[PDB]
Amino acid sequence: FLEPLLIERIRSEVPGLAIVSGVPTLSEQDQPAPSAYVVYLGDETGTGADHQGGQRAIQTVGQQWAVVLVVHYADSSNSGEGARREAGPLLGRLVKALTGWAPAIDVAPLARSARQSPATYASGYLYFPLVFTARF
């Protein structure tokens, strides 16, 4: 219950052309700019372990959080050259800022996943079903 203090800098208006898009199916044909395009998948819950405490019946609630990549630059049905090759550094930047960059945390792990996040394509332009953990 303290993430906003760092979320403020986590979010930095990634797209320069998209304005008031309310970003978080994709168009892939008329998007003004390659915005972050965050997505939500689900949640993780469990008890009977170190997560659960005493009063208030709360536990360390597992949280899910994913993103969608929209570049379509150098990849317009030609080949996957420049779609993720350029994203690599961008993917690292996104995964390091939006996740893994947490405030002073005691019971808020803010789990981050640098690797082991497979993504498969479809629709003929670009799909990226990212899989990351939040834990908070």
Partner: protein, 137 residues
């Protein structure tokens, strides 16, 4: 030049002008004067297109409504991609509606600072008037 960079900054804040004008630095750092000048020139050209049939082109003074219209159109022109539901597009459409109303003689071009604008002589023309036998002979 119905509007200037100062007018754009005042109407839309310097941050937004910097964001929509700096295209080479990410994040933006400075306002590109050339891009702003071109956008303002395009807005002025559209306004002149709308106002050529009722007033003189090289206006010696800028009416305030003209300043607001020019600022809005210039800001709308600074967007490389502008969708239909973008509120800036709606503001541009409203300003264009105001311009069309002015052109069709439903709205008057207001005072500049204290004096009236300069309407063209389109309505003045009459043949000449032949009225001999009526000159107190």
């Amino acid at each position: 030049s119905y509007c200037t960079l100062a007018d754009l900054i005042e109407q839309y804040s310097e941050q937004k002008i910097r964001e929509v004008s700096d295209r080479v630095n990410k994040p933006a750092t400075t306002i590109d004067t050339v891009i702003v000048d071109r956008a303002i020139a395009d807005a002025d050209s559209e306004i002149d297109l709308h106002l050529h049939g009722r007033y003189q082109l090289p206006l010696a003074s800028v009416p305030t409504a003209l300043k607001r219209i020019a600022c809005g159109l210039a800001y709308a022109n600074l967007h490389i991609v502008l969708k239909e539901e973008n509120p800036v597009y709606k503001t541009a459409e409203h300003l264009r509606k105001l311009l069309s109303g002015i052109a069709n003689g439903k709205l008057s071009l207001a005072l500049d600072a204290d004096g009236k604008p300069a309407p063209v002589a389109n309505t003045v023309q009459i043949s000449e008037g032949r009225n001999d036998w009526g000159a107190d002979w």
